[PDB]
Amino acid sequence: NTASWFTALTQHGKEDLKFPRGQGVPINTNSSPDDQIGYYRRATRRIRGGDGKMKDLSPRWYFYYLGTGPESGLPYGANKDGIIWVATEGALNTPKDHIGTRNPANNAAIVLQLPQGTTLPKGF
Numbered sequence: 001n002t003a004s005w006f007t008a009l010t011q012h013g014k015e016d017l018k019f020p021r022g023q024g025v026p027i028n029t030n031s032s033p034d035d036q037i038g039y040y041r042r043a044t045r046r047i048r049g050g051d052g053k054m055k056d057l058s059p060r061w062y063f064y065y066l067g068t069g070p071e072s073g074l075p076y077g078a079n080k081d082g083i084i085w086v087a088t089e090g091a092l093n094t095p096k097d098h099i100g101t102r103n104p105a106n107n108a109a110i111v112l113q114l115p116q117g118t119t120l121p122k123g124f
Contacts (some may be wrong), residue, residue: 004069006112008060009040013123015116017042017061024086025095026063027113035096036088037076038065067095077095078087 008028017040025036040061049055061084062069065074066067074078076093077085102109114120 001103002069003104004062004064004109005099005107006063006110007100008043008062009120009124011042011061011119011123012060015121015123017124019084022087022089023091023118024114025088025091027108027115028110031065031099033088033090034092034094035065036095038063038068038086038090039071039074039085040064040084042082043083050069060086063102065096065099066093067097068100070115079103084107 005028011017024040025038028035034038040063042061044058044059045057046054049058063086064071071078071080071083072095074080074083076087
């Protein structure tokens with residue numbers, strides 16, 4: 001019953017998601033400077049293609065605050081395939097259980113917006 005608070009970054013290229021130190025955290029006016037830390041989780045979807053065979057769709061990366069989402073128990077910097085970490089300078093390395101996850105039944109997803117001067121890899 002839980003989803004990301006933001007819309008996804010679609011991976012159109014061959015390279016995985018990666019942000020330079022300090023960049024990557026989506027803008028949220030309902031959050032404070034201490035909360036600006038989390039991870040992007042890759043979600044690949046498979047569909048029945050025009051030839052009957054299963055084919056992959058462009059991967060989607062969803063942001064979740066630290067201590068929240070499908071990898072709530074993972075600490076910052078944890079090595080896991082499909083998980084990349086982001087944190088703004090000044091955010092505290094503590095769980096963000098007060099923000100948590102979004103319930104789509106009563107909350108719309110916030111359009112993913114990166115701060116001014118955020119660099120994204122090719123195909124994003």
